[PDB]
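Researcher: Going back to the complex we discussed earlier. I've cleaned up the inputs and rechecked each line, so this should be the final set. Can you rerun the prediction on the complete assembly and write out the structure?
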Amino acid sequence: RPDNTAFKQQRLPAWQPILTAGTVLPIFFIIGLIFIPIGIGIFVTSNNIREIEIDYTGTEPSSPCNKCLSPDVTPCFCTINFTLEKSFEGNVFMYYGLSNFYQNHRRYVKSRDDSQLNGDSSALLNPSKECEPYRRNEDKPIAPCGAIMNSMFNDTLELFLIGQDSYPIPIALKKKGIAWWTDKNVKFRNPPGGDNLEERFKGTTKPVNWLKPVYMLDSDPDNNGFINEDFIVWMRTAALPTFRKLYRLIERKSDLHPTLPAGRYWLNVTYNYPVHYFDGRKRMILSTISWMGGKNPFLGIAYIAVGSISFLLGVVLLVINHKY
Amino acid sequence: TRTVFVGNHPVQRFCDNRIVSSKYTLWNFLPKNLFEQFRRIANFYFLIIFLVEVTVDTPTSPVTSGLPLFFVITVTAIKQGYEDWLRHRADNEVNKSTVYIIENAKRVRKESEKIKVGDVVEVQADETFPCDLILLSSCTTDGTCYVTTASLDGESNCKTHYAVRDTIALCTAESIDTLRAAIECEQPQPDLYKFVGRINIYSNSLEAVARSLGPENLLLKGATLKNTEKIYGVAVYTGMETKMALNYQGKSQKRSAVEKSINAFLIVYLFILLTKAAVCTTLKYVWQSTPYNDEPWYNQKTQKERETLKVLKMFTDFLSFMVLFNFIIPVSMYVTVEMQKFLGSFFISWDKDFYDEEINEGALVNTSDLNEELGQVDYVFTDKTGTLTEKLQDQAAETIEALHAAGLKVWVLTGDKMETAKSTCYACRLFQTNTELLELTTKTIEESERKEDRLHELLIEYRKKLEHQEYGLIIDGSTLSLILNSSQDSSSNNYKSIFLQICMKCTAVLCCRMAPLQKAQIVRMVKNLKGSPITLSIGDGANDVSMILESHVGIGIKGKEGRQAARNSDYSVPKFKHLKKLLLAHGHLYYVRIAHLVQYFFYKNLCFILPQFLYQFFCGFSQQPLYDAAYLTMYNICFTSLPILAYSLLEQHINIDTLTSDPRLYMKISGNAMLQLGPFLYWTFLAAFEGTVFFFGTYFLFQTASLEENGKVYGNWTFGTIVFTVLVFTVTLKLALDTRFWTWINHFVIWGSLAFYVFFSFFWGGIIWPFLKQQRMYFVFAQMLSSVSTWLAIILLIFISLFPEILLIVLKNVR
Ligand SMILES: CCCCCCCC/C=C/CCCCCCCC(=O)OC[C@H](COP(=O)(O)OCC[N+](C)(C)C)OC(=O)CCCCCCC/C=C/CCCCCCCC
Ligand SMILES: *[C@@H]1O[C@H](CO)[C@@H](O[C@@H]2O[C@H](CO)[C@@H](O)[C@H](O)[C@H]2NC(C)=O)[C@H](O)[C@H]1NC(C)=O
Ligand SMILES: *[C@@H]1O[C@H](CO)[C@@H](O)[C@H](O)[C@H]1NC(C)=O
Ligand code: ALF
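Model: Rerun complete. Updated structure for the full complex:
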């Protein structure tokens, strides 16, 4: 005789739910009544975000920055004029944006040595072959190696508010707290060979497009070497050829004054980064945030649309069921 | 005409008496089996993909492509080798048996395979005849012996054979010193009731006599001497040329309709993969025709890539796209199919409804590769004696009624006589008092000219000019031989085709006085009909082995006729009534489970890979993966493996009790319905729509400076992680919506797959791993989960992807 167990006789206790039009029709109404208010909330939250984007590539001759496309003097400076029609009230975030830049190219993405960037002594002196042809230079290893490191964005952007007496008031920018906490504090680390950083990079060389070595990125010891936040922000490669990178933070004042009052502003630009060779563009983005992030109507519009479609289909089915 | 000398004495060179039923030897097994396995397109493609991953490029390890292929090949080889070794053991049992040869006035004990043509073989009572013998003498003075031929026609009645009259007096040592004779007989043939020969008994009078020989003088191999103390015979046909061996055919490889559908789906997806790779390569080289698109200043090539030949680089890029998108043909599906086929077969052997107290045995599973075929039967070819009868079996008529209500055609193929077969058919209610019987037998036909008239009349004035239950067909073995041997040299006016036309719209067909090969021939004729019907044959005797091997699924009955039918069958049951449970419940469940598994595997892998294909249009067609390598590796191993395996082993879309009590539900899945063009297109377009929704919802979500309150920016790895999360949840919830039978196992696997995906994401992205060369996923999942807008987008994309399924659910369950 066989074993008369529930599993072996295919008679295990089961739930056996039933899914019918009459028992699933109310979900097409609940989903609508949940999605539509959420979509309206997201749409309203996204509309209250104050954003400005300034393109300073300078491809047009009438641009304050055409003189910087192909410069003669090494440090080319350009100021751009823009107006804030409405004051920025909360925390303001400064972004730079790059178009037609393929940080997601397969050859680009692998061009890094994460063991080196994590502060590993052996990887510091023997960078991986994957970060070539940016691996060795002048018979010395490159301390940050690879194309991503070598191509680090290096424009300098400063903001001035035009005062009532035509005197530009500089807006203070913070370079800390822009990167992920975990990749600043764990993923990116510095070599451990002492306390002075210039000695801890003894047998290495700087990237070929670098001006100063990696231990001169900042005077602050917590933002100097591999833990420099501009460097980390650049090294987190982007998903799409048009992208934005967090540059500075404009913290709200202790008082109730606007962070960026409406008026006239200047855009100090130290033009070091060329993009016109591959037809890219350079932007500066000032924006406020919310719980949802930056300005993006997609989520609110999509939630509203899906909720409305669900509600309409539910009404159609309910009317069909009541024909009798 | 072959000439046989009675004692191999002067008054040719034939085969030996060794029988072979296996197809492999020890030395050629590996080459032959590997050649057969790798002649299949799926195995060849998997080997090619593994070689490309080893030599050219791969997004993951080549191990994950080589190990499953090795597992599948090894499992198939082990199964085939074990089955062939069982055939070798059976052949060794049939050979190597003790036979006695009168060699030089003395009894010589030899081995069965060592019998020559033309030697005197002595057979005692209850002994099987080792070869085809011409009866020379017996102990009795009348020269008559009784024989049972149950292994040739399935009947236990005694048959009378007669010795040669001039040799009836030859006994003891008189059969060698006083026997110089020559036999002229025809070439071996499988008729089993027709023998033409002549013996020339030479004596000292120089006047040799000549006596004609018939089937009454021929003792066939496989028959048993009954009630006769001892006989003397001379071998005229030896192993592989005896009528038993000529009525044996050997099994061709049996492939399920689900396996054939898997092959077709693999061909379609191979075309899809090649098209995707070709499009990607063409667009990549159109894109790179811009000198800043290929090698910008920030992304420069090395000297080797610049000095690499352009044509070789084009080919290598095509191969890289191939391995990037290869997951849409999943080898994990083949691994899971093997596992499910092996594990699910245990339900037949465990089923207490197949247990018989008389023999203290239940059902037997010989092949686990035909479980789904039990749910696709169209024709049932049943033996009569010992299968339909014991007086019928316990529920023979009721089983036939249930098979009819399932939409199946039941034909009786029997080696018994017409009258008893017809009486059984009336008792089983295959023929009713209202059924009009059309008789293609030796009584109604005496020559081949009248046969064609009968066929034409039953075509054009009785049956087509008509009431399906109105007509039944009876045909005997000789008339079937006339049909099958006289319908050549024609294609349009095919009398075989006319006969099949008569058979197809008869309520039942009785084929009586059948030889073992003729049953297989009938099954083959039905198998070659338009629409490709699935055939099942069931029997309890050794003469049912040929039709059991010929049919799509063969069923042996554990009866009193031995175990040859059971040992050669795919499945064995004690009783004929067990066929109802075997087909209506077990086969239905098996087919539905495996068909859903196949469709789900293809759908989930297309959902997996399509966003990766779409991502090439936004990188430089650079073969950059959208997902992390660990995600690519464990999508099919750890994240989406166990729920479908649990579904294919436990799901009861209809309860077993309902399936047993309603044979009409068999017709819902009748013609491989779940794997036809309609369902395949539904699954494929659902996968395409969901993948497009995944990728482009994430794309439009990423059209912002930040998705966080701290203003921080996400990258390509977070993009891919969001896409992967939506994908995993969508496919799991699709399976959950498909589920109708929720056990604790199903709950565990379905919800624990999602829980384990989250837990693994946290654990893998929790620690800077000290053994890998990259840390690309250190806190990607954790950072992504800090974004309320990302949570909302994930939820919305999951709902949008499952919306067509929910809408179909509400539409199909109304009105
Ligand atoms: C909490 C409750 C819910 C559960 C939560 C989840 C927890 C995690 C648990 C899951 C593990 C369950 C395992 C089930 C099976 C899944 C694996 C499978 O089935 O998927 C085959 C896989 C993946 O394949 P893929 O489609 O992704 O393609 C590869 C991709 N590509 C071609 C591009 C390289 O591939 C492989 O790594 C192969 C692995 C499969 C086994 C085949 C290899 C065996 C080795 C061979 C030895 C030979 C044995 C021969 C027989 C001996 C007699 C016994
Ligand atoms: C800013 O970035 C640009 C782009 O990398 C740097 O330009 C490169 O500078 C090196 C060193 O002088 C040259 O060999 C390369 O040919 C330059 N490349 C391009 C595309 O112009 C530039 O030096 C950086 N300026 C700084 C660090 O202030
Ligand atoms: C940037 O620096 C000064 C600082 O006040 C600013 O006013 C000016 O417009 C910019 N360019 C220069 C260097 O003159
Ligand atoms: F038992 Al049979 F054909 F073998 F009726």
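Model: Worth noting: The two ends of chain A are 56 Å apart (CA to CA).
Researcher: Good, that matches what I expected from the previous run.
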